[PDB]
Ligand binder design. Structure first.
Ligand code: CLA
Ligand code: CLA
Ligand code: CLA
Ligand code: CLA
Ligand code: CLA
Ligand code: CLA
Ligand code: CLA
Ligand code: CLA
Ligand SMILES: CC1=C(/C=C/C(C)=C/C=C/C(C)=C/C=C/C=C(C)/C=C/C=C(C)/C=C/C2=C(C)CCCC2(C)C)C(C)(C)CCC1
Ligand SMILES: CC1=C(/C=C/C(C)=C/C=C/C(C)=C/C=C/C=C(C)/C=C/C=C(C)/C=C/C2=C(C)CCCC2(C)C)C(C)(C)CCC1
Ligand SMILES: CC1=C(/C=C/C(C)=C/C=C/C(C)=C/C=C/C=C(C)/C=C/C=C(C)/C=C/C2=C(C)CCCC2(C)C)C(C)(C)CCC1
Lengths: 160, 38, 30, 160, 160, 38, 30, 38, 30
């Protein structure tokens, strides 16, 4: 029994491995904000930016020049905001150059047609900005309001 | 650390401008220049 | 030492080669 | 003089009462963010979310486990953010199932055609997220910055 | 050599002066959020609102009734939020009246077609709201977190 | 400054409502009324 | 002096000409 | 209140995960499963 | 009492019936 097959077309340079496209990776990649069926841009970008802004307040808050200082969480928030702004500028200029239709693979047989235009990628960039700012500020608020929150004591004792 | 020279606050503004702000502006503008079609 | 106002005077003097370098670079492009 | 008429079609199961559709309820329901003529989604959702996030920082800020504690306004802000996020997840999955054209009544003879698609309801959900977060944070900032603001002393002396 | 020409059509009441439309003002006005080619509304409005909310936390923070008080930056943030909200209400009612196609000039031969509809101006207004709130809060956070930041000492010693 | 009269908190609510909130509402509503077509 | 409750009583009494002024103004428009 | 048992911080993470996070995930996923057409 | 590391060891051991329960449930669906 060949569990590693092609995608239906063998001469295309890809293989349908269990990791690539079997049953659980076709879903949860087609159900991510990118490649989900019903979402518009400025909603895909909102979800992606919220997740990214939330995760990126982890190596700036406890890993920085100010991490031994009470200004450390605020400096990590400002650094996350700056990185999200730089990434939004990158997304905006990537769209402003001109985008093509995204690459269709075995995992994603249907790519979002709304991201194939410059106007869709501008909405994605704006949603990424608002989401990144919101996620970074939400992670800052969650890390700052108990003022110790000993989950942050974990992975800062590691990153001493 | 501010210096004893006159207008010591100008390194605190120009150095992040010339080291972070305008290189980002120049790379964005040159990226749009070298990647635009026609 | 020089004064604080002399630094801002030299900066707005330096905008005169600032503009003219932009004017030469665009005409050298053409 | 029959002030309680039908809507023009008697065999439809509704009545045009003064409360339902007379002169002042056709307007101000057709002029709400939902059912307004010119608005797009991610603007209807923005207005609705801003109003909802602002009103929902009333039973969490002064009514909670921390309401006798200085962390009470911050906990109310976090609870409002969590409720807005849960409601945004509900809106997103309601759209992701697939929406039909909204019900046309006597009060609203014209329903928004832009909310009849899955892409429009995704923009509505994203606007609701940004609006709810903004309204909750604005109400938190307004309640927190004078630090007493004796309008909050009213309806907390009631809710003692 | 006539450096001051017309735009190609002399009987139109405008002149193509160096300031108006020569080489550097056709670009950087066609490359602003308004009149840029690839952007959608709720992205033009986002950029415009972010710039406006950032600049408007300058005559409210250090110029106000509370500017000698520690509540001064917070009052300036609240005043910037209120002005951005009033301007968003103005944009929303300007769109809700009904917009025409924007005026085409020598500097801008192509105006955004997406701002020629009521739905586009609603997205612009929502983006202006989110951008203004984000820019005002970002300027508040930047001015507040070092708590002195002696660039604010400049132009407050002037505005003593 | 709150007064010695009964319900002194009502000037703190009604005066910004009648001076800021409802004039903004009335100008918005009258603007939509006088500028709408047909 | 009058009581605090009398001010709120006079306010909800004043809503009765508040509603009826809105009802007269719309019928005067018609 | 943290316990004297080893890894006392794990009730502070797993109990809100199993009581709030994954039931929300399971109801969202099962809602999308039972309400999708075809 | 057991150590702190033994709890994390038992958790990553418990991922082995965690994965295999997901694998059985999908094949029981088919
Ligand atoms: C090419 C000549 C040269 C070079 C190598 C430097 C280098 C330096 N200057 Mg500058 N500067 C120069 C010209 C020069 N300067 C002149 C003519 C003036 C105007 C009177 C000044 C005024 C000045 C100020 C007031 C400050 C510096 C500072 C700095 C430092 C960081 C750069 C920065 O942020 O400020 C650059 C800011 C400017 C206003 C310079 C504008 C550009 C000048 C006029 C020359 C143009 C450069 C080049 C010819 C064009 C690009 C060439 C390309 C191929 C690389 C660095 C030591 C900072 C400092 O001391 O930090 C510790 C600071 O705050 N400079
Ligand atoms: C036309 C008559 C008149 C006038 C000129 C005033 C004027 C004043 N009143 Mg008011 N008021 C009136 C009627 C009047 N009132 C009556 C009948 C009541 C109900 C019992 C009150 C109850 C009252 C309260 C409880 C408060 C005031 C206060 C105020 C002040 C600011 C307005 C404000 O925010 O509250 C206006 C709030 C209202 C509830 C008034 C509603 C409107 C009234 C009923 C009359 C309608 C006005 C007019 C006829 C219609 C528009 C005409 C147009 C052509 C201009 C100001 C001194 C405030 C104050 O003392 O601040 C220091 C305050 O908090 N008023
Ligand atoms: C079905 C058996 C069973 C039951 C009823 C419980 C019940 C409990 N456990 Mg758990 N647990 C079990 C198995 C079990 N456990 C085993 C085998 C391990 C791995 C060695 C642990 C490891 C463990 C940790 C480390 C912690 C708990 C804790 C908890 C409490 C809250 C649940 C929670 O958040 O953690 C659930 C977290 C898990 C990692 C459990 C994973 C699921 C296990 C392996 C069994 C699967 C359940 C069931 C068979 C499948 C669904 C059946 C469905 C029809 C309902 C509760 C008292 C918490 C506690 O003590 O709070 C005070 C806590 O932090 N558990
Ligand atoms: C350099 C690596 C790094 C660092 C040190 C941290 C550190 C932080 N993260 Mg983060 N994170 C990381 C990478 C990082 N993150 C990545 C790669 C992801 C994606 C898997 C996440 C996803 C993530 C989430 C989902 C959460 C954290 C949270 C946390 C905080 C508490 C950690 C905790 O609960 O421990 C025990 C802490 C500020 C929490 C947080 O931000 O709350 C304030 C939290 O909820 N992070
Ligand atoms: C459980 C009910 C409840 C509670 C206790 C509160 C309590 C709060 N609300 Mg809220 N509110 C409620 C329901 C609630 N709200 C509902 C149902 C709505 C819709 C009508 C509103 C709409 C609302 C607005 C419009 C405002 C308040 C404001 C307030 C604050 C001061 C109240 C005030 O001015 O009193 C006297 C306080 C935190 C204010 C606020 O959030 O400012 C910080 C304010 O501006 N609320
Ligand atoms: C009444 C006029 C006024 C006032 C007093 C200020 C004052 C302020 N502005 Mg602002 N600003 C103004 C008009 C004003 N602004 C206008 C017209 C623009 C558009 C050109 C800007 C664009 C602007 C930017 C781009 C920045 C400032 C910044 C600043 C702060 C420090 C100023 C500085 O670096 O000095 C030396 C201070 C709160 C900074 C800020 O907000 O950071 C917190 C900053 O980054 N402002
Ligand atoms: C009759 C109504 C009235 C009322 C109640 C006020 C109220 C106020 N004025 Mg204003 N003003 C008015 C008429 C009025 N104004 C008119 C007619 C003029 C023109 C001559 C002025 C000229 C004037 C100037 C030029 C200034 C004031 C300022 C102030 C503030 C002083 C409080 C303080 O110490 O700073 C504390 C300030 C704050 C706490 C900021 C309040 C901002 C609020 C909270 C935002 C609300 C957001 C809201 C949702 C949007 C607006 C309402 C919406 C329904 C449209 C206060 C908010 C000063 C100020 O601070 O500006 C805001 C100021 O600089 N006013
Ligand atoms: C078994 C799971 C479980 C867990 C872990 C909790 C946890 C909690 N409950 Mg809840 N609840 C549950 C089941 C549970 N609930 C159910 C089944 C009922 C119905 C009978 C209730 C009824 C109930 C009420 C009515 C109230 C609580 C409240 C609380 C909070 C008390 C903490 C405190 O002192 O205030 C501190 C509070 C906070 C720090 C706010 C936490 C908000 C978080 C941080 C937002 C997270 C955002 C997140 C991304 C979105 C949600 C998760 C997402 C995956 C869907 C805490 C968050 C109280 C509260 O504060 O409400 C929030 C409250 O009023 N609960
Ligand atoms: C599942 C899974 C996975 C994954 C994992 C991960 C990766 C995670 C992450 C996670 C995350 C990463 C999360 C995040 C979250 C986020 C959030 C939760 C956010 C929110 C936010 C908000 C809500 C905000 C708000 C706001 C705004 C918007 C504005 C204003 C301000 C504020 C702040 C209010 C894997 C792959 C392993 C596989 C298996 C399964
Ligand atoms: C009129 C009327 C009525 C109604 C009433 C009510 C229901 C009210 C409510 C009200 C409300 C409920 C209000 C609200 C408001 C809201 C607001 C005012 C908001 C705003 C916000 C903002 C502006 C924010 C901002 C931001 C953002 C966005 C992001 C970042 C951060 C910040 C915070 C900055 C009735 C029915 C009786 C009938 C008669 C008449
Ligand atoms: C260049 C040039 C010019 C101009 C100048 C100016 C006018 C400037 C301004 C500037 C500005 C005016 C800037 C601004 C900036 C802004 C920004 C930087 C913003 C950002 C923001 C953000 C990022 C935020 C965030 C957030 C959100 C969104 C929500 C939540 C919260 C938070 C806060 C996180 C002229 C004409 C002379 C000509 C020559 C050249």
């Amino acid at each position: 029994i060949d569990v590693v097959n092609h995608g239906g077309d063998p001469q295309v340079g890809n293989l349908s491995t269990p990791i690539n496209g079997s049953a659980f990776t076709k879903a949860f990649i087609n159900a991510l904000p990118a490649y989900r069926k019903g979402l518009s841009p400025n909603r895909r970008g909102l979800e992606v930016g919220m997740a990214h802004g939330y995760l990126l307040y982890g190596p700036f808050a406890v890993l920085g020049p100010l991490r031994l200082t009470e200004y450390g969480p605020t400096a990590g928030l400002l650094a996350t905001i700056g990185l999200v702004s730089i990434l939004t500028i990158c997304l905006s200029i990537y769209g402003a150059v001109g985008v093509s239709k995204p690459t269709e693979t075995l995992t994603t047989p249907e790519v979002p047609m709304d991201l194939a235009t410059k106007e869709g990628w501008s909405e994605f960039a704006g949603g990424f900005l608002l989401g990144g700012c919101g996620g970074a500020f939400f992670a800052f608020f969650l890390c700052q309001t108990p003022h110790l929150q000993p989950l942050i004591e974990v992975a800062s004792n590691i990153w001493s | 650390i501010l210096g004893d020279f006159a207008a010591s606050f100008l390194p605190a503004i120009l150095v992040p401008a010339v080291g972070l702000v305008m290189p980002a502006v120049v790379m964005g503008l040159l990226f749009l220049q070298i990647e635009s079609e026609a | 030492s020089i004064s604080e106002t002399q630094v801002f005077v030299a900066l707005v003097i330096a905008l005169i080669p600032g503009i003219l370098a932009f004017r030469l670079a665009t005409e050298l492009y053409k």
